[PDB]
Ligand binder design. Sequence first.
Ligand SMILES: Nc1nc2c(ncn2[C@@H]2O[C@H](COP(=O)(O)OP(=O)(O)O)[C@@H](O)[C@H]2O)c(=O)[nH]1
Ligand SMILES: Nc1nc2c(ncn2[C@@H]2O[C@H](COP(=O)(O)OP(=O)(O)O)[C@@H](O)[C@H]2O)c(=O)[nH]1
Lengths: 318, 310, 447, 441
Amino acid sequence: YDLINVLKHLQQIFLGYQSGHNVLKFLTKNMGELTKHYRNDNNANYDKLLQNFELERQSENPNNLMRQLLMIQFDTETLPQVLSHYLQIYPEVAIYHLKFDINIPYPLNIIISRTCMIKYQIILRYQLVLQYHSRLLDETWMDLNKTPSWKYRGYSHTVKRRIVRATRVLHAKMNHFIKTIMEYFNQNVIDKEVYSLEKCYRNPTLAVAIQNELEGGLTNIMTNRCLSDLIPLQLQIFDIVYKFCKFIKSMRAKLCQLDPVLYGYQEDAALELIQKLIEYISNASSIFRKCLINFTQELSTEKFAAGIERVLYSIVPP
Amino acid sequence: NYKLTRVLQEAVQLSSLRHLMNSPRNSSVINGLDARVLDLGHGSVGWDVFTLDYILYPPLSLVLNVNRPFGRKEYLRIFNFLWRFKKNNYFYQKEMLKSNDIIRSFKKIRGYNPLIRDIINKLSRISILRTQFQQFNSKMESYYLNCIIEENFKEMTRKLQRTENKSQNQFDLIRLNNGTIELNGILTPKAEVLTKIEKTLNIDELESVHNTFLTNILSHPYPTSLVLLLNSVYEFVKVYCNLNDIGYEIFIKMNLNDHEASNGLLGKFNTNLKEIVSQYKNFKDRLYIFRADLKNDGDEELFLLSKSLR
Amino acid sequence: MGGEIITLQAGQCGNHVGKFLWSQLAKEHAIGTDGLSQLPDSSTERDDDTKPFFRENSRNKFTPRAIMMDSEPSVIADVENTFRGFFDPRNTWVASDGASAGNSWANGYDIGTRNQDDILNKIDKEIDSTDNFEGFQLLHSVAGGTGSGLGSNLLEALCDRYPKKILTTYSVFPARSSEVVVQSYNTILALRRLIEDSDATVVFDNASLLNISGKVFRNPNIDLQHTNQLISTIISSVTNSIRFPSYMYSSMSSIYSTLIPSPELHFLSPSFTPFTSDAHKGHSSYDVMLDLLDPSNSLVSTAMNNPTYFNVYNTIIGNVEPRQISRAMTKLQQRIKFPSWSSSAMHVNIGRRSPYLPLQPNENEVSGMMLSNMSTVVNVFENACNTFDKVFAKGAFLNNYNVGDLFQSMQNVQDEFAESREVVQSLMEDYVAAEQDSYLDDVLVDD
Amino acid sequence: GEIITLQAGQCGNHVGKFLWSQLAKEHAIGTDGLSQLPDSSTERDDDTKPFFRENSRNKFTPRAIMMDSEPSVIADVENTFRGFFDPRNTWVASDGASAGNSWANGYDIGTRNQDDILNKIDKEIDSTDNFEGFQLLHSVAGGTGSGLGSNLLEALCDRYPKKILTTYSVFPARSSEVVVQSYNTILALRRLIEDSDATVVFDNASLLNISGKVFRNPNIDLQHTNQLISTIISSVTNSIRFPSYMYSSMSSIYSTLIPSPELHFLSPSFTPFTSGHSSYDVMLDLLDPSNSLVSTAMNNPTYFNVYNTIIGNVEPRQISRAMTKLQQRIKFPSWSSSAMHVNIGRRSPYLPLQPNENEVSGMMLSNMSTVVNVFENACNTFDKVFAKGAFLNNYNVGDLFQSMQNVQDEFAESREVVQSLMEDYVAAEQDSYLDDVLVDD
Ligand SMILES: Nc1nc2c(ncn2[C@@H]2O[C@H](COP(=O)(O)OP(=O)(O)O)[C@@H](O)[C@H]2O)c(=O)[nH]1
Ligand SMILES: Nc1nc2c(ncn2[C@@H]2O[C@H](COP(=O)(O)OP(=O)(O)O)[C@@H](O)[C@H]2O)c(=O)[nH]1
């Protein structure tokens, strides 16, 4: 059967195993409609994304049967809502409802149980959503450093500080934190499981042991603090990063009012706008940082984790 | 009947097919070629009265199922559809060549200064306007055949030779209407045996492939959207046929009689010119709507057609 | 809707090109140098020859449906001495007096009428060989006064003798700015008559073809005998849809219907993908066609000054994938410019690689060609324009070319010349009107 | 995400051929364009696509253009390797010439024929799948660098305003010629500073110090050290070429490497290897300035950003322990609270870890304050000679030809732009530089 290739493909699909270019490829184009689904009804044009995926499946490798069998469905319940049934995960007291699954033939289905598929589905949704938001922030960085309105000159130190440096300072902190989490999750969680599975194929003697490890790793991933402590807080981290990204993108136009190139775009009106943009950054940076530090402190009381320390290091100031 | 059948035979001889018609290893396939006359509910119509046929005899009749009274003779509905495009090709092709003949002679003689200039270019522009009408049908004919009939045909022919170690697509999934695509007919781990013979089709399987083809096209917004535009091209051509004959008489008679006799030929043109303009505008708006229908369908192929109409 | 085609060579340029053409056609259909089928006869493939271009006899000899004319009898003979049994000499003829042959104007224009019966006897005998006749195709050079004059007299005579038939030509002008002073009368007159027939032509100056032959063949010594190969691939592929027909194209009548909506602007500008006429591009079916729009591989003066297109035709040959080429069509749509008047559908066919060619080791080595109707095609013979402007504007050389008692009066010479210049200018007037959107309102808004 | 590399003169093309050779080896793709891998499998665990074009015949060439003013250098690479290059995409200067090793020379070739170099670049982009930012390598002061490399950045900014421009900068004059090359360096930097999005500096001292310790021929300086530098510049794409998940693209990495783009130059640190062990030690070994690529006396510099990718027999527990020196040794970014970022694994499968090997290698790069030692060399040199009249009046080509006024103004304004870079390296380490950013807000 070549089960090794099959599972490697499954890992390539749900754990992102050596798939950085595939996740970025997935996001390419699709992010344009993905941002609309939590801003729309259940009558949303899900079909447009489904077609984009179908077209990608047409342009696919003939031997990678695991991709050929892969499909996207939409729920109405987003991750924190579906995850409300888990005892360790606290609900809000909602952005993505995109989910992937696979139809498995019996020779494999006996291994690839529905339980593991559910765990794979939910783990991937976590990985995808985090990658999604990480990507928005990265593209925002490139927009910041490309767009002429963000490269104004000779206005004031007040604006260079309150708009440009303030944007970069908050952006960098957002970036350091979201990336460090991703690094932890892969380096100290997923890599270990992929590795463990490779170890279990070293002339294994028992089929069951393999099956137990497959389930074992999926649980080890699901019970990690990066999900259990983070989800209730992730809700605010993403909402702030997401809105910030929108904000910075709109500023590609709004900040034209700092340079003569603005010419109704007049300077007193520009000051009203500039100060409103300033307040936004101040309020957003204040709440984002305070929420993260409150959490950083809470996470420091739990001794439970190599990259948890790394994540906390990335947020705790000098 | 003598003429009807004699012509069918001539058509083959005329085509490149003629050498296979005479081939010593075959030849006989051509003998199944035949045709029919339709009672259209009217005894004097022409054109539409015709359909082409082919008759299978056992053993071939057992596999290729050319529909008989048990069904609707569906293969002739596609023939007639394609035939309507071909009828169109005849009608506009003849008239544009008639127009070029008129032009070749119309511009042959120039007299009485500017007066000649006032007319002429008025009618060469019709032949130019006409291009939108014929391009539409030529391009759609291409679409229907090259993107549907030919593709499904190729599908059948790919299937038929898969036996000889062709691409190993053994990942046949069944799409359900609810969006779930579930593997089936492949419920085996490639049937790998590890420790170690022709995938041919039997008679019913071959018959199935034939019926599959018919289904692939028959089951492929209305088919009549084409008809509105295809009929508009025909109506353009019929008006145009009259425009070309009047135009030739202008060329000869108005120049034997320098505006001395048959004055007012352009009055019949004005009636006919207004109709081609109206038809043109209707054609352009319906074509615009057609592209609108294409984008409002959701099919990537129809989006390509909307773009490629440009 | 279609029919047989008789080709014609008129002047040595069509014989040098003609031997490359016939050689390639012979390869395409396993014809051989003696004209006989080179294949074992398996009685397969309905398209084993093209009825429209050849007359097959009991020896399976494929007699070209062609007439060969020149003013230089040794060129006719050398092609006959190449096609050693293939090209039947009964249809060849030399239009010549050694004394008149060196005079490009007098040779052509005197023979066009003086020898009209010799020119026509070969033509009428072959047209009457069939019932389902469609048209003629000539290999020419406007510089080639021999061809200009007999071609001009045939353009008019055949339009009158055969009012509904298709009459065309492929015309190669040398890329020379000063060698066209002496050509100032026959090249403009070739146009004076080419403009009179909407079927007449695909035009080129060999400018880029010369430069192409010097980069693609392993021979930097660019010359006609190393460039006619490129001419051969571009012209041979034109009839691929006739030779190996499918659905839309099988004939010149069909090609005409979709490529030249305006009888007035029939002059086309050619290009091609790598070819095997004397080649393996290494790309997808969409990329090979995109390169056809790149002027650096135009067969004529290359870069055009933002040309406006009135109509573009393409053919792609090989393992063509309709989806790949959809990327190409989208991309070409953003490069081809036009008024709403010429916002026609572009038409692309799919041809067939002949079964008698060496088997292609990789079916994805897709090739192809483009023909386009553009306003800037008038720049192709710019060198002739430069010298006929200097000459015609002055009334230079009237009858100093020994006009054959036609327009023997200098004023009458100038009047013929004036008509040829009226044609040059009216050609561009129509190309400019063709760049208008309002062109459409003139007969739709108005009555 | 396709990358096209632009190779400027001897710098770009020699390192380029050494790099393409290193890649020819790493992907078993072939120095002659013919895959070195067996045909026993149709599947791969790498991604050559972004750097090499696959032909219809499964043959390969790099996505790169060799620079036009130095046809003898272009020929060196195209003729030595040949099968692994595609000369049809290479622009050659319109006059077949290079009018001196100077800014004016290449700048003028570039401005005069900007359209022709762009037409070759632009046509290749159309043949690829989603072009990803431009990669450029040059000697900042040289004819192909200060001259054409500077012109390319300007040309690319207007033709491809939506793409990322990333460059590799190598050390300025290593000899007394600095009194000339420092002027070219400064004009070059004006363009590099104003137009690029990101870059990096490679110091001669490390090429030579490494050479002295790694080659058995210690007299090697810029030649052959080009292979050492090409193994250094491999870490830049390994996560793409032997794909990973964490940092798989340009836009996903630069936001992590240099959040504040004016300080666009990174300071690499790398342990050389032939073509020690533990993740714990390879990470820690790169904090030692002797392994840096911009070596100086500042053994106690501050940092704005530190990043590292370790490839090999990786042990995450060791990485966790190595982190102790992140906390103890990196002077904190008191102005921005940044922290070190990492990536791991993806050893080329065709150059696998050998039996009994637990070795790892990797690249540390950082945005460090004390990197002025590879820029001031020109800024504080050309100006003292310049003030006495430019020493490049024998390079009066193009803009320096048009007027002596342009000569003096281009040099002086460029120095001011460079001075801003020097001012920014320093201002950036002050807490007061950014504290007011959020306090007065
Ligand atoms: N491409 C090509 N051009 C030719 C050839 N022979 C002559 N020409 C060109 O044709 C023009 C002269 O016409 P030519 O055929 O020699 O004179 P003709 O015999 O009176 O028709 C000039 O533009 C020549 O460059 C040839 O074999 N190939
Ligand atoms: N690291 C490195 N530096 C080089 C190399 N070749 C030249 N340089 C340096 O580049 C600068 C001169 O640039 P160069 O490339 O030779 O001139 P160009 O051809 O006009 O661009 C000086 O700083 C040289 O030390 C090389 O192969 N490697």
